[PDB]
Design a protein around this ligand. Structure first.
Ligand code: A1ACR
Ligand code: A1ACR
Ligand code: CL
Ligand code: CL
Lengths: 122, 4, 122, 4
């Protein structure tokens, strides 16, 4: 018999993104080639099958630095990290291939699905 | 607020 | 020119609640009288003006245990912690006074607003 | 997916 606040989840994600922009309570650095991205492990886990597996590992759960596969493009990762914290995906003709490949590696199934749909249309 |  | 995934924020919150239920990456214990509640500082901050202030404090940000004011009712806190992680509020005739008082202390303005509305109707 |  609960009541529900429609905007609650969106408001929570908005505040988590504000914490990310201000580097508050960030507990991991994701290294992608020469580039570094600060984030919250819980948000990464909630969005990605790969980060979910990494941070549930009894040894990796305690690492402050995670290095991604050298094939991963920093821009594709940046676009996906922004999507994790906002629900908004900056999908463009020039980045769609790198975004799909990065989403497949990160195991972000809904992003992979829209990338496949957008590629099929063109 | 709604009835979910 | 971004696209948006409508269910993303709700899915993120659902996964954060799954992490809470399994006690994964929880980094704080909230003590309410004899009762203890494990949670994620970032989720508490995103939902509550009080926790936002506590965990942005350069000294309190590093505490693993937070003791609430002894006037705070553990059931009211439990109902509000569940709401933080689900968007669902178990508001009942028998708990509405304790829920409103706890939401005022925690600075959860939308919960305070619906409690005032529900009390006014009766 | 939508146009926000
Ligand atoms: O496409 C995706 C997105 C995703 C997110 C998560 N994260 C969780 C899943 C569960 Cl069941 N509980 C907790 C968490 Cl944090 C796992 C796999 C995938 N695949
Ligand atoms: O009723 C409420 C709910 C709430 C949440 C937060 N948390 C944040 C606010 C901002 Cl601007 N950036 C980041 C965070 Cl985590 C503060 C005050 C209140 N009052
Ligand atoms: Cl996804
Ligand atoms: Cl609220």
């Amino acid at each position: 018999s609960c009541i529900q606040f429609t905007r609650h989840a969106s408001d929570v994600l908005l505040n988590l993104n504000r914490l990310r922009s201000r580097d508050i309570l960030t507990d991991v650095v994701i290294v992608v080639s020469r580039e570094q991205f600060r984030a919250h492990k819980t948000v990464l886990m909630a969005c990605s099958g790969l980060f979910y597996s990494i941070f549930t590992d009894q040894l990796k759960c305690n690492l402050s630095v995670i290095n991604l596969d050298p094939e991963i493009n920093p821009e594709g990762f940046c676009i996906l990290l922004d999507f994790m914290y906002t629900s908004r995906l900056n999908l463009r003709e020039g980045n769609i291939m790198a975004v799909m490949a990065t989403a497949m590696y990160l195991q972000m199934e809904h992003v992979v699905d829209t990338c496949r749909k957008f590629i099929k249309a063109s | 607020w709604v009835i979910p």
